[PDB]
Ligand binder design. Sequence first.
Ligand code: CLA
Ligand code: CLA
Ligand code: CLA
Ligand code: CLA
Ligand code: CLA
Ligand code: CLA
Ligand SMILES: CC1=C(/C=C/C(C)=C/C=C/C(C)=C/C=C/C=C(C)/C=C/C=C(C)/C=C/C2=C(C)CCCC2(C)C)C(C)(C)CCC1
Ligand SMILES: CC1=C(/C=C/C(C)=C/C=C/C(C)=C/C=C/C=C(C)/C=C/C=C(C)/C=C/C2=C(C)CCCC2(C)C)C(C)(C)CCC1
Ligand SMILES: CC1=C(C/C=C(\C)CCC[C@H](C)CCC[C@H](C)CCCC(C)C)C(=O)c2ccccc2C1=O
Ligand code: SF4
Ligand code: SF4
Lengths: 742, 146, 144, 80, 132, 146
Amino acid sequence: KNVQIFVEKDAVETSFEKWSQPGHFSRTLAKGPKTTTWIWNLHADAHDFDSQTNSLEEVSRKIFSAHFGQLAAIFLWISGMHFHGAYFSNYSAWLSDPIKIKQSSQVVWPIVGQEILNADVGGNFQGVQTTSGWFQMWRAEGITSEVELYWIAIGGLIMSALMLFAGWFHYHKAAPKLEWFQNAESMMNHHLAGLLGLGCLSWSGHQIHIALPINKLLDAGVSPQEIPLPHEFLINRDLMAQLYPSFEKGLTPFFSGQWGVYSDFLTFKGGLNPVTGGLWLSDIAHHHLALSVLFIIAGHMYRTNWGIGHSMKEILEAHKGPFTGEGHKGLYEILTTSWHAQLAINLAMIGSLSIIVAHHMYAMPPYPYIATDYATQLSLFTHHMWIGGFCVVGGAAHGAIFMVRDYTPANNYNNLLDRDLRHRDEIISNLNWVCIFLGCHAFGFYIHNDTMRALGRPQDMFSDKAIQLQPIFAQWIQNIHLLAPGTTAPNALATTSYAFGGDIVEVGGKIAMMPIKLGTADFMVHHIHAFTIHVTVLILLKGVLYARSSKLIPDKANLGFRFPCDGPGRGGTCQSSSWDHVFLGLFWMYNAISVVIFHFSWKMQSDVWGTVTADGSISHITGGNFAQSSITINGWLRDFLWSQASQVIQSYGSASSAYGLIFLGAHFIWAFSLMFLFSGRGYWQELIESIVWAHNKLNFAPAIQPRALSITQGRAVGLAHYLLGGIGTTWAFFLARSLSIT
Amino acid sequence: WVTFYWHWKHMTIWGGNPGQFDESSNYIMGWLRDYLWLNSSPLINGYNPFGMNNLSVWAWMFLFGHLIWATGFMFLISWRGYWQELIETLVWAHERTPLANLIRWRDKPVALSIVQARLVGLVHFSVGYILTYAAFLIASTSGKFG
Amino acid sequence: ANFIKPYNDDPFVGHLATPITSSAVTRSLLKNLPAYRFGLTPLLRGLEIGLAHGYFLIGPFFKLGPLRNSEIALFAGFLSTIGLILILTLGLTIYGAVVFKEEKVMSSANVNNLQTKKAWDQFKGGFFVGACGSAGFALICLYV
Amino acid sequence: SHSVKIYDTCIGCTQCVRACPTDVLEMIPWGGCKAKQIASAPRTEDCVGCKRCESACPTDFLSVRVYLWHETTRSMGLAY
Amino acid sequence: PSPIFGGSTGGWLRKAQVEEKYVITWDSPKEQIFEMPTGGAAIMREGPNLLKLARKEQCLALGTRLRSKYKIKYQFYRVFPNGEVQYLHPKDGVYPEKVNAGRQGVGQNFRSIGKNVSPIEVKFTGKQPYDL
Amino acid sequence: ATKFPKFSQALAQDPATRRIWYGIATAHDLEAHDGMTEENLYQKIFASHFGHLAIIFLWTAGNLFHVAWQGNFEQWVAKPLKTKPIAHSIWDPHFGESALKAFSKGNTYPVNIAFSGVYQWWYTIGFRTNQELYAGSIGLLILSCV
Ligand code: CLA
Ligand code: CLA
Ligand code: CLA
Ligand code: CLA
Ligand code: CLA
Ligand code: CLA
Ligand SMILES: CC1=C(/C=C/C(C)=C/C=C/C(C)=C/C=C/C=C(C)/C=C/C=C(C)/C=C/C2=C(C)CCCC2(C)C)C(C)(C)CCC1
Ligand SMILES: CC1=C(/C=C/C(C)=C/C=C/C(C)=C/C=C/C=C(C)/C=C/C=C(C)/C=C/C2=C(C)CCCC2(C)C)C(C)(C)CCC1
Ligand SMILES: CC1=C(C/C=C(\C)CCC[C@H](C)CCC[C@H](C)CCCC(C)C)C(=O)c2ccccc2C1=O
Ligand code: SF4
Ligand code: SF4
């Protein structure tokens, strides 16, 4: 057998000795501090496990146990939330009337006049309005009572302590060997079939037996109280056959292969629930079933201990064309002997996933009563755009850490990796052009519109009334999705989303979904999206390809991943390291995602969101100003930023006045960053010397000598304040704007 | 800080309500809302979809300033050896493309130096800074005349 | 099989011989363009080039012009093609006035060479004739 | 070209010469310190100016010193 | 005797045939793969090896990787467009890190650094404080 | 030096584009030029002071000329409380029809309103006609020639 369990017993003694010696993990820091730079190095190097030991087995043991610690903090986080929903919320009052009661799971103490933050939300309750969608998620599970939330909170605490115990057990008591970690084919079979497959099967089981029948009674108008205990849905088929009259057959049409009997709970109707404005739970139960069969079957594609199956190595090595040379040879050693190469894939995938997740939750809203909560819709969408943005660049950082540290030329003669490095001047110069081509056109469309309008010539602007730029490719695709129910998807009753066209869904007088028409003002913005992604890719790609050498520095790989420069000769060598490429690309991701959430917040408010009256008279939030006000920069500056600021700037004395303070606080922090980004270290260290003198004059000085922040560190400070202040100012602007319109 | 203060104090004396500045000038939000947000109305309405006015040039100059100030950030945050490596791929590309090979520079293209980037980034931050305030202070006063 | 080798069997030279660089299509095509054709006076080299450029520079001026919707939409733009050619020619005069050096010895056995001061002047004047003439040719072809 | 000067506080521990990435400095015989050797700058025209030599010099203040000078194609560090 | 390499776009430019180009020679006892300063990988040939590069640093960077990573030792040359060659590394066959009788003093100030003159003293002259 | 910077032999032998950038930015740093003596230094500065003085009087002579030629000084002197003073006229082929009507509100042609305060200044020092303003501009053109 090749797949076995290898574990070392009693590997590391558990004592408080090392806790009292900061910097024990590295060879240079263990001597103790001499300057204040030591304190900074202590934190920057604490998780760099690769630079602490040379053994791959010891690095892998540290990573494994740290995953248990990360999960234990997530369980504690989840257990808190459920606890707040059970003791500091208005969940019951919300369940009885989820159109008038606003949501809240946080209560502040009254101590310095801050009680004003407890808003008058409803249901004889005062608290801070929360926009995480905990409530809607609980209704979809069929919660209905605070008691049930309490058990989740106790079970979250127990799981959290189980994780803490497992991470301690696997690092000190039962430390598993290197052979165990290097089992990719086994690991893939378990994550596909076990984690994802049995996860979707059991979840589907909860949805069919507990979540489906409770939701049917809530939707029909039954008060929570009259709904029976969830376990009573598991015992009496009489209760289950009244709602879905195919339980009288039981489980026999499943083993006879007559699955169309269950069309009561395995639907493919599409659209949304006219009552709640969320997806049909019956579609979601079918969704998890079809997934779980796919995941369990996919977890049999690899060979472990029995002959049958694929070896990952013979797959990749078979793929070689006459342009690619050796093709995929060597990518195994890479992806089974280096943790950096793994994160580079994984973070790029998980970050892309969170972006994908945010696009699908506003167009096909999966929870009930969430589509008309515009504060939740807006908050959840931007959040995943940010988390997606950070993880994507984080994949590119580890790709460049891999090229510097784990990459070897002898392991890769003439393969795809070796070949990319060989024409790296061609990838970068061609990308460079595509960037100069996309920016001059997409941003120059706005300038033209800014000058034409200012010169009194609107007849010559790129608009829906002048020179049109109609997005005909995306309009063509919308028609296909609209005509799809019946033809291309003959068993589908309605379209996947109403964005491609169809009818208007409304819950409580508010609009949940509407067709989203695309015109030339849409078209122009989509290129800005195109353009800012291509530039971000230009910086990160360049950092990975030139991580080891350049024409400028031939021995860049000997200097390391993150070095400040190679001196003021050879012209300027500042920011040549691949860490500095990651540093620059963080500012672009920021630039790119900011335009995305600006585009989403304004298009939804202009052309979807709003209320209605008799004869379907739709009144939008900003009244349809999107086709003729977003084609110029002045229109974006005056109608989006200036007009919609009125809430956050007039929030004083109200319950949303914390958003006005955090608004100013983040404008302050953002400006504070510019002191670190524009200046440099040797002006600050001379400044410290005059200060130290005033201390020496008075007979005292710290024995840990004060030293200015280093070149690399002064950049990482200025970037962290730039993001914090920038994202924060928008955070405060988005919530005080959307709480006032929801 | 001196020019905002001198202007805001006069706009309220001319407007006939000196008390507006006497109460809102104690906290920052007062400055941000009653001076900057409240007085930019006639400037940014210089031109719009409906039409344009005499003050369109100040509105165009207002945006102009914001752009030059923001391009000043490029020269101040991103340093030289990023740019030097980029130009080396551009020198390569130009030398390998047929029909563009007949033309050639007489001065080797290189990235601006360390001290040159600071001076340029400084001139952008400066010219953008002054032009956007000139744009604001002139049209907010002439657009309200009091 | 390998479709990528070092250009001219020189592995250390910084070039790659790919089907975009050196294939039978791109070899015969580039060898017959007027900037690389064997048997052309530098006037003729500039004439042809100019004949093919002035003809399509017309288009974006006549269609997306400031006076495109007037009865003098064709005139407006033709004039502005001539003004574009005057700027391009001006870039050709100054480039050759500085890149090439005057010859001491009347010795001239290659009067055909393009990369010289005397021939560049002929090449520059041929560009101006062919581009103003092709600007006028589709002035006739569009007046229909 | 750049200018590289070497002062008498040089203790001759060869660390600047081992750090130079373009072979500008060398060690020569000298009778003024324990190691009887001093650094020398015979090829300052290959000097790119990266100052790696000064980051390696243990004396306080430095024994080796680089001063900015007129730039050629070699000190600009160009490969074109 | 050029090593085994499939080529790359990071090699020499016009500067080679117009301005000085550099070659490096080394001797290897066996066939081993090394990293190119302008390219990712290449197999060196037993016996003498000859490589052409565009910069002195690129040549010297390869030497450093050939020294403490493979235990081998090399010669640098400057080649002009007319055909004149120059011999550069090692200058006198002996490495610069090791003292060799016969070398001389170039560019040495016979005093410590705090002993330089004020810039006002050398006013209106064509020098500098560190050239006195 | 025999290159573009003729005052820096060390900047004129640079093969990169940096040479162009530096010859511009060190042109006035007279003490650092090749072969500069002290007596020649003071002479160059002195003559540079004359040329600077002439640019100021040429600048003033401009402002007198544009108001005398295109302002409303005479109409302003008659009613200084109602009329808006006129900087100079606009001629820009890039203006739409509504631009020409927006910048000519209250006048006959396109025009910029002055915010320099030269009107109030000239009024209190004696000026009353356009002929006097024009005469003052000729006297400052002659002074600049001297
Ligand atoms: C809003 C942005 C911003 C801010 C806040 C500062 C802040 C500062 N800069 Mg500046 N700087 C900026 C932008 C900014 N910079 C920019 C864009 C540049 C161009 C690169 C510079 C360039 C620069 C240089 C060259 C110099 C400064 C200096 C200073 C200091 C001035 C002394 C002072 O004000 O003490 C007050 C301290 C603060 C305002 C920092 C905030 C502290 C907060 C947390 C206090 C909270 C209030 C209250 C005390 C709360 C009590 C605390 C609690 C524990 C009880 C201070 C740290 C000088 C310096 O360091 O001298 C001492 C200096 O020489 N900066
Ligand atoms: C069916 C088997 C199975 C399952 C479910 C998992 C599940 C997991 N593995 Mg894993 N693994 C397996 C087999 C399995 N592995 C094998 C055989 C190997 C050796 C090749 C590995 C080697 C391995 C490594 C090296 C790492 C993981 C990690 C992880 C976690 C990924 C993070 C995540 O998605 O959190 C989702 C979290 C949850 C779903 C919470 C579940 C918490 C526990 C573990 C419950 C599962 C136990 C049991 C099946 C539940 C029974 C339910 C009951 C009602 C019947 C996840 C908990 C990573 C990690 O985080 O480690 C801590 C990691 O670094 N695995
Ligand atoms: C699963 C995700 C993941 C993992 C495991 C790692 C792991 C690692 N990264 Mg990495 N990275 C990630 C995501 C990840 N990263 C992402 C998303 C990015 C892009 C932003 C990066 C960018 C990145 C760079 C650029 C570098 C690393 C480095 C490292 C290594 C050492 C980290 C260390 O010691 O930090 C210790 C941790 C800290 C010092 C914590 C400070 C975190 C910030 C400053 C505070 C956050 C603010 C807070 C959230 C809000 C504040 C509010 C305020 C009011 C208080 C380690 C291998 C470094 C390295 O040397 O690689 C080997 C390195 O140079 N990573
Ligand atoms: C508003 C500020 C601003 C602007 C305009 C730019 C502009 C640019 N940056 Mg950026 N940058 C900025 C801030 C800014 N940056 C900041 C704050 C940082 C610090 C983090 C950086 C860091 C940085 C890096 C690290 C990179 C860039 C890149 C680029 C270039 C993108 C290519 C392109 O489309 O150019 C086209 C020009 C524009 C989009 C702007 C003007 C558009 C005009 C109006 C249209 C065409 C005009 C025409 C050509 C000339 C006619 C006018 C004239 C006759 C008067 C471009 C020059 C990237 C690059 O060079 O890749 C190619 C790159 O890698 N920048
Ligand atoms: C780059 C963005 C951009 C674009 C696309 C336009 C587009 C336009 N502007 Mg402009 N403009 C811009 C930015 C831009 N503007 C900026 C930034 C400003 C502010 C300074 C202005 C200010 C401005 C004014 C004041 C005016 C215009 C006008 C115009 C129009 C005509 C211009 C003209 O004839 O040019 C000539 C065009 C060309 C010579 C075209 C060359 C490009 C060709 C097609 C490229 C072909 C590439 C080819 C595919 C390569 C493959 C070859 C292979 C197949 C062999 C046109 C709609 C005028 C108008 O009336 O508007 C209607 C006008 O009066 N613009
Ligand atoms: C401050 C000086 C100045 C002046 C006087 C002009 C004048 C003009 N511009 Mg221009 N422009 C300038 C600066 C200037 N520009 C700058 C700095 C920019 C870049 C930001 C532009 C960008 C710009 C654009 C994008 C466009 C103009 C256009 C125009 C024309 C106005 C529209 C019209 O009705 O013409 C209509 C034009 C005609 C009826 C025919 C005119 C043909 C000309 C006069 C032929 C000239 C021939 C001659 C050989 C030119 C030699 C040039 C050189 C040797 C000096 C007009 C000729 C528009 C244009 O060219 O229209 C086609 C236009 O699309 N301008
Ligand atoms: C929310 C939450 C929670 C909770 C959770 C839970 C409550 C869970 C559950 C879960 C579950 C409760 C699961 C279940 C599972 C089950 C399963 C998964 C089953 C399966 C089975 C099967 C698969 C079968 C098979 C078969 C057949 C069909 C036939 C033949 C025979 C056999 C046996 C083979 C916690 C506390 C953690 C924390 C916090 C959060
Ligand atoms: C798109 C495309 C393409 C391309 C194409 C092209 C690019 C074309 C061009 C074409 C052109 C661009 C053409 C031109 C033409 C021209 C002409 C046709 C001319 C004519 C002229 C004439 C005939 C003459 C004139 C004159 C003179 C010179 C003198 C005076 C008199 C006259 C006026 C007569 C391809 C194939 C790749 C593919 C597909 C797509
Ligand atoms: C200001 C600045 C410094 C000076 C900053 C230093 C020396 C760090 C000071 C951090 C202190 C010691 C940590 C404790 C923070 C404060 C004592 C408390 C402030 C927090 C409030 C909320 C109370 C640099 O060292 C530097 C280096 C490189 C580029 C730019 C810069 C730069 O801009
Ligand atoms: S400046 Fe750099 S290249 Fe010159 S001698 Fe010192 S270390 Fe060597
Ligand atoms: S200058 Fe510094 S590194 Fe060089 S020999 Fe002297 S002490 Fe050693």
